[PDB]
UniProtKB/Swiss-Prot annotation, chain A:
The chain holds residues 118 to 250 of 250 of the full protein. Homodimer; may also form oligomers. Interacts with host TIRAP. Interacts with host MYD88. Interaction with host MYD88 was not confirmed by another study. Interacts with host TLR4. Abolishes the interaction of host TIRAP with TLR4. It is an enzyme of class 3 (hydrolase). The active site is at 75. This is Probable 2' cyclic ADP-D-ribose synthase TcpB. Keywords: Host cell membrane, Host membrane, Hydrolase, Lipid-binding, Membrane, NAD, Secreted, Virulence. It comes from Brucella melitensis biotype 1 (strain ATCC 23456 / CCUG 17765 / NCTC 10094 / 16M).
Length: 132, 129
């Protein structure tokens, strides 16, 4: 069982996502990455389910390219549902832009790359899966 | 004579710039922005002073399209009182690559506040001038 899977739009795959995968692996976290690229046509809910069935936590990179995939509204709202094992990260989006797709997601407190560096975010995520 | 001018890259003009202007005008503020689209030749300090002569405050939309205009590092480090940058759709790592000072400076941030909250906050500054 891994620590994280990271769901992301492909457009983000070789930028911020690879940065965050490398930083988290460098701290010793186990992260699924390659099989969690989201493309037009996929099922977000099923992809999230799949990841959670193999990992402690789910990271979803909330970016313009993420929302541009036009996901169903309820599956976005679903990311906010407690059992949380889903940790959104806001990346290069505005509040209004996120509320346009999901008000519940826009009010759910999450990590934000404009407030922390990729390293700082790695450390914080790492804290969730480490004994100290 | 004016409350704000909005310095921006052309890419933001019909998007975030439009939203902010509309919101601020709704609150009764006086704003111009049309003459303040920034290109590459421009001297960021000159453009800003030019606007500060005709306007109480000046807004700079710090987006990726602003940073893509390859501003001289010195103008970025001394970007900022009367100049108010707003971070728009950028990361900290991203801003830091252009100016470590600019990235550490507390500023407005659209990932934290809706356009309307940002407008209210800027509007309250007029009444404090």
């Amino acid at each position: 069982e891994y620590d994280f899977f990271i769901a992301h739009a492909i457009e983000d795959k070789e930028a911020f996502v690879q940065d965050l995968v490398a930083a988290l692996r460098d701290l010793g976290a186990k992260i699924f990455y390659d099989a969690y690229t989201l493309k037009v046509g996929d099922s977000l809910r099923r992809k999230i389910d799949q990841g959670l069935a193999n990992s402690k936590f789910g990271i979803v990179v909330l970016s313009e390219h993420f929302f541009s995939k036009q996901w169903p509204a309820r599956e976005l709202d679903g990311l906010t549902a407690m059992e949380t094992r889903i940790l959104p990260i806001w990346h290069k989006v505005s509040y209004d832009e996120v509320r346009r797709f999901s008000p519940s997601l826009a009010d759910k407190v999450a990590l934000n790359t404009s407030l922390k560096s990729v390293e700082e975010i790695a450390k914080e995520l790492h804290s969730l899966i480490s004994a100290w």
